[PDB]
Amino acid sequence: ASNIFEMLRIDEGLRLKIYKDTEGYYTIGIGHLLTKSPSLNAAKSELDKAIGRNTNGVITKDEAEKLFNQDVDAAVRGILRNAKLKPVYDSLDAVRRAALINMVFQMGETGVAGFTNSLRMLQQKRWDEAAVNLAKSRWYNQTPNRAKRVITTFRTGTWDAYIYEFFSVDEFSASVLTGKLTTVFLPIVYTIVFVVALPSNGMALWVFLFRTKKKAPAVIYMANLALADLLSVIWFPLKIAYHIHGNNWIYGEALCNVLIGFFYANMYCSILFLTCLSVQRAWEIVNPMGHSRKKANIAIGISLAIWLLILLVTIPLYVVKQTIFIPALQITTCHDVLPEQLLVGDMFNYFLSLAIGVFLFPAFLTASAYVLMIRALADLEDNWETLNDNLKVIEKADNAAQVKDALTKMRAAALDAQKATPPKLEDKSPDSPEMKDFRHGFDILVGQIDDALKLANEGKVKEAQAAAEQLKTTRNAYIQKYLENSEKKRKRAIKLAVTVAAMYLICFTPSNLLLVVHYFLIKSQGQSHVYALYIVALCLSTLNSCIDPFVYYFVSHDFRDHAKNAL
Ligand SMILES: CCCc1cc(F)ccc1[C@H](O)c1ncc[nH]1
Numbered sequence: 001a002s003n004i005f006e007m008l009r010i011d012e013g014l015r016l017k018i019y020k021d022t023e024g025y026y027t028i029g030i031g032h033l034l035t036k037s038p039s040l041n042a043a044k045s046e047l048d049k050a051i052g053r054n055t056n057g058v059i060t061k062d063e064a065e066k067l068f069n070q071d072v073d074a075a076v077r078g079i080l081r082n083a084k085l086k087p088v089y090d091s092l093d094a095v096r097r098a099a100l101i102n103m104v105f106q107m108g109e110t111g112v113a114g115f116t117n118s119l120r121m122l123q124q125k126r127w128d129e130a131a132v133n134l135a136k137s138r139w140y141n142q143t144p145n146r147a148k149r150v151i152t153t154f155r156t157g158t159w160d161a162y163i164y165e166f167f168s169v170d171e172f173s174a175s176v177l178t179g180k181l182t183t184v185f186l187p188i189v190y191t192i193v194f195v196v197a198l199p200s201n202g203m204a205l206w207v208f209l210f211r212t213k214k215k216a217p218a219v220i221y222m223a224n225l226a227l228a229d230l231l232s233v234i235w236f237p238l239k240i241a242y243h244i245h246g247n248n249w250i251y252g253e254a255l256c257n258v259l260i261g262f263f264y265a266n267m268y269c270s271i272l273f274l275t276c277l278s279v280q281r282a283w284e285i286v287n288p289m290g291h292s293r294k295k296a297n298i299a300i301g302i303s304l305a306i307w308l309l310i311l312l313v314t315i316p317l318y319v320v321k322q323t324i325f326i327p328a329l330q331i332t333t334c335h336d337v338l339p340e341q342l343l344v345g346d347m348f349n350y351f352l353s354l355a356i357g358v359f360l361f362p363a364f365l366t367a368s369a370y371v372l373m374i375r376a377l378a379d380l381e382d383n384w385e386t387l388n389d390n391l392k393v394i395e396k397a398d399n400a401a402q403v404k405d406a407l408t409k410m411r412a413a414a415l416d417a418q419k420a421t422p423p424k425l426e427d428k429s430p431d432s433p434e435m436k437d438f439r440h441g442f443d444i445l446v447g448q449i450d451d452a453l454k455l456a457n458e459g460k461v462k463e464a465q466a467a468a469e470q471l472k473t474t475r476n477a478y479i480q481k482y483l484e485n486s487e488k489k490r491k492r493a494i495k496l497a498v499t500v501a502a503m504y505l506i507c508f509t510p511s512n513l514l515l516v517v518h519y520f521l522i523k524s525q526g527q528s529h530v531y532a533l534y535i536v537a538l539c540l541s542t543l544n545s546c547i548d549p550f551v552y553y554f555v556s557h558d559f560r561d562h563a564k565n566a567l
Pocket residue numbers: 186238239242249259260261263264334335336534535536538539
């Protein structure tokens with residue numbers, strides 16, 4: 001391309017017969033509009049008086065140029081006539097002047113005058129902002145390839161958009177998209193995840209629905225967690241095939257956006273449902289309640305709320321073009337390459353919003369939940385331990401000092417465990433009969449400790465020791481039943497905290513951090529060297545559905561049975 005006339009020939013083409021354009025309007029020659037009515041004869045009448053003769057639908061190669069050269073002169077006249085088009089045009093360099101005339105040639109004088117905001121940007125020499133504004137319009141929607149070339153002309157001020165057609169991405173990306181990292185490493189890891197995560201979550205989902213007859217809020221969160229897992233792993237056979245064949249998608253744009261949707265869905269559902277589960281289980285320890293049926297219904301509603309909120313927040317991933325054909329690579333990439341480099345500004349803010357509000361914020365609530373959970377389970381452990389240890393001391397103490405001392409320490413140890421929630425009565429309210437019998441079991445014990453203290457304070461040494469065997473009976477009858485396996489419960493919480501931390505360290509943190517970094521560099525330089533790390537990050541993020549079964553194992557008691565029996 002050299003000038004306006006040469007530019008338009010490339011956009012409008014050259015046809016000597018009346019044809020329907022992309023929208024359906026009958027045109028002829030080089031982008032010469034005849035009429036906007038669905039009538040072949042109505043276009044004939046407008047052509048005959050435009051030429052001067054009866055062309056009968058077919059014009060000459062010479063008459064095309066003569067009519068084209070007049071359309072350009074009129075397109076310019078309208079620009080200077082227009083109060084909104086003239087000042088911008090007077091500010092634009094000859095290259096950008098052609099781009100403006102190209103728009104007027106296509107949408108007419110009035111149409112282009114509607115772009116008031118973009119024209120102001122072009123006048124203020126703000127090429128990038130103007131380019132973005134123009135990228136979101138019906139103009140871009142109806143004729144994207146056409147609009148891109150013109151927009152690029154505005155942005156760059158060169159004829160490059162008409163000299164060089166798109167051929168390839170940056171070199172660093174093209175090497176990755178042809179390298180073994182994507183074509184060998186990824187499909188292997190993804191295959192593993194498919195074999196491991198699908199049946200494990202498949203069975204977990206089955207247990208939570210058809211084998212768990214508790215239906216506690218924890219089960220419900222884990223059921224959606226398993227559901228989020230499944231709804232992504234099922235698409236992996238198409239995901240694996242994609243990479244094996246050199247990152248080439250041949251299943252359609254809609255089906256690509258499906259995979260993309262459910263990918264980021266599981267990405268964020270997992271975090272949110274982890275935050276729910278962790279907080280819920282921590283909350284049943286610090287401040288337990290007793291509406292296991294109502295608390296369940298609530299947890300279901302919360303899950304629906306989360307599912308719909310993510311369906312709404314992943315809209316700018318569903319609705320945007322996510323496939324692009326790269327001529328030099330002869331492949332059609334899904335997700336891995338952004339088809340429209342003008343939307344990077346929107347993409348950056350978007351993944352920065354999520355990285356804060358749907359990553360850090362739930363991570364903060366998730367970590368501190370285990371902080372309160374572990375400590376509370378550690379205190380109850382210390383109580384049960386202080387009880388047994390001091391009770392074992394009395395039977396092995398000779399002096400009156402060690403006897404009175406152990407009784408006093410054992411007394412306070414039982415008074416703290418009394419206020420604490422037993423491992424069994426989790427969904428039981430603190431005012432329930434079950435809890436009242438639990439506390440009463442300590443009241444009987446504590447009273448007996450006072451009866452041994454009564455002897456220990458009255459100098460009756462050996463007689464207070466005999467009371468210890470009476471305390472043993474009270475322990476096994478009323479207390480040990482409840483605190484038998486509280487130290488085993490503490491160990492499960494810790495392993496759960498380790499499990500979750502690893503999931504954050506491997507699947508969540510590398511992904512969300514780099515997602516911001518990736519689009520930040522494309523926004524700043526047009527390319528990112530972290531592209532390889534971005535890919536590895538996204539790959540390792542799918543491991544969460546392989547780590548998720550370990551979560552169900554440390555929380556669900558029913559899942560353990562089906563886990564152990566199977567293997
Ligand atoms: C066809 C689906 C392509 C896709 C879509 C996503 F939403 C996330 C990752 C990938 C892709 O598998 C990948 N892994 C690592 C980097 N890119």
